[PDB]
Design a protein around this ligand. Structure first.
Ligand code: I7P
Ligand code: CL
Ligand code: CL
Ligand code: F
Ligand code: MG
Ligand code: MG
Ligand code: MG
Length: 134
């Protein structure tokens, strides 16, 4: 069940999944419909689901990683697609081999230096590139 803010924007949560506390390398996943493109893993908050809980759940489903939840980076709108995403830092401590989206839709994952993550997100996901700006 998709959930919405009072202005009709879909509610989402995502994590910047860093390899370590140095926050130098981040895990991106393939687009579901366009597997040659990269995205920041994330998805819809469920009814009454805390944003931090949604963020960690979606990263597990889409990227097959777990770790230590860190700070809220910010809340980011996509005006054209009408969604609003809570973005958290996650420091990855567990990388699991056969995760929900790998099994179900063959979703890929890959580590990027922050500057390269910004580069591959810019064209189709400029708001997700902006998650890294600060
Ligand atoms: O363009 P489309 O139809 O292929 O889907 C878009 C997006 O549609 P929008 O742009 O219309 O909002 C989906 O949101 P919806 O509006 O359908 O709910 C979104 O799901 P999401 O919010 O993350 O929600 P969860 O499924 O994770 O909960 C999905 O992410 P994937 O999870 O990766 O499939 C995106 O694909 P892309 O970014 O390419 O991978
Ligand atoms: Cl790192
Ligand atoms: Cl976006
Ligand atoms: F999802
Ligand atoms: Mg999802
Ligand atoms: Mg998603
Ligand atoms: Mg979901």
């Amino acid at each position: 069940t998709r959930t919405y803010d009072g202005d009709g924007y879909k509610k989402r949560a995502a994590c910047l999944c860093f390899r370590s506390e140095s926050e130098e390398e981040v895990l991106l996943v393939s687009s579901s419909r366009h597997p040659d493109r990269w995205i920041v893993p994330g998805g819809g908050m469920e009814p009454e689901e805390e944003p931090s809980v949604a963020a960690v759940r979606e990263v597990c489903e889409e990227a097959g990683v777990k770790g230590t939840l860190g700070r809220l980076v910010g809340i980011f709108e996509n005006q054209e697609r009408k969604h609003r995403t809570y973005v958290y830092v996650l420091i990855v401590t567990e990388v699991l081999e056969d995760w929900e989206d790998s099994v179900n839709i063959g979703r890929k994952r890959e580590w990027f230096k922050i500057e390269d993550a910004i580069k591959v997100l810019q064209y189709h996901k400029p708001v997700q590139a902006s998650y890294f700006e600060t």
